[PDB]
Amino acid sequence: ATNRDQESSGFAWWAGNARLINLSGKLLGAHVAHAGLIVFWAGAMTLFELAHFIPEKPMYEQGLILIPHIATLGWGVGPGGEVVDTFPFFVVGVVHLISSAVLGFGGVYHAIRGPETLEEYSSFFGYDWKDKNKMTTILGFHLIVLGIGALLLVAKAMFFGGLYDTWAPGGGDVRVITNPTLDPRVIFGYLLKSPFGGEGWIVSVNNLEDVVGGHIWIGLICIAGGIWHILTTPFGWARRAFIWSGEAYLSYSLGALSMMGFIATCFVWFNNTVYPSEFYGPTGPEASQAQAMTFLIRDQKLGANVGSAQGPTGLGKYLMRSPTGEIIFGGETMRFWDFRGPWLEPLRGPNGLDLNKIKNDIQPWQERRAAEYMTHAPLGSLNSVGGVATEINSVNFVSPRSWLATSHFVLAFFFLVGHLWHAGRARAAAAGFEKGIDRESEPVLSMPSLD
Amino acid sequence: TILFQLALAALVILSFVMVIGVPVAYASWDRSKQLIFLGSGLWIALVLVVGVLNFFV
Amino acid sequence: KLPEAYAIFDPLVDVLPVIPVLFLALAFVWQAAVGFR
């Protein structure tokens, strides 16, 4: 019964997980039981999503966030994002949920039964937070494992089925990506892409070649960064640049996760390659360009002269120019002219949209996909009424893209706050004034006046 | 096919005794050792028996 | 839908994802049994 009141730890009940900072066996069971919770939710939600699953309806019309992730991997989906076998979804639900009891056993074991600290039973597993080479050894072990995980995705993409390609010919199909981009000027040229419009930093990855080869590059620098951090100790420039505390590494991870949640929010909102609109629905960009296309289609079918047709303002109602000069979709969707989907690349020639490819060359699957993507925009309410805020309660639709971007913005902002909390605290803790100011040695009364 | 639901309801109920009986025995001994071990191995047994019999129905 | 040998246990799955929300609330039951000491 150490670190379990505020008499022994100096941490209250609402910061009672901070009583486990120097309890390596108990902090391990904290993390394995929590790992069991993520793998439980991965399991139980996938089962909940597949028990309440209609394979007639598209995935975005069903409030599904996890079945689209298994479907993106190339499991149980065929031509155009259509489910032909729900058993690869069910196995992912069962292998996760059953594995959660093993991590639930081992989380409960190390937390409430095992040795409270690992520093006695196993010097290999026993760690001090301020032991810098051990803290890279666990970092090197976890880097190789994420290098193993980023090579499993390459394995599923290159050997074990291929991933779903939105840019497959003739519509979307699961495609074995056999020639991935190994070129580092393309892989790391994504890193030097601007985040802003038309460039879209790494969210603009628009083919499964750079995805697989980028995960060969990430998957092997994480292995080679694991072998780096296993075989080395931190260098002297880094020892003076970091707080070496348990809460410090937490804050560095929290700040890293705030980056990742803000990026994955942007991936699910803008990218329709690694988040195919077959499964996740049209993007915000995708639905506004689909609306301009549907009425480009409808009115030219009534014989409108859509290139010369004017808006109220002088601009093209259907076809105006981007500020770089490309023929783009008229209307307010001029903000979304940097959008690339596969239902309108047969329109895009080298000047932007080709007017002669609009007149006698728009296929009925494109009219179908644009009308579907317009009426399934990622606009919706919190009670899941589809449409605008002024829409009536008939359409039970919020996109998974809206659910995924907003949840991973709520989480990613708080993880920035949690980084600011824990980075401020862990540097206040390593300097010795997180509990307050000493009255006998208050720094400001020893600090000179201002004016 | 119904005795696929004899191992599946021997795992929605054995998990219900092993969701109480494991954090109760761990947080309370030798009988609890021979009850956790005999049943956790039975839990790994019956996820394999359900794991084979779904392909047979 | 689930595979048809699994629909007996379908009301179980319908409340299976509420379980991780209740682990958070169980830490408050456990903290209240010890009186938040």
Partner: peptide, 27 residues
């Protein structure tokens, strides 16, 4: 029913905590 699942799923959380209180276990 879905509720009698979620009742016994929900009740048997604090019954872990009920047992370790009425057995004076390591609460």
């Amino acid at each position: 029913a879905q509720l009698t699942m979620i009742a016994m799923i929900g009740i048997a959380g604090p019954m872990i905590i009920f047992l370790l209180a009425v057995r004076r276990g390591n609460l």
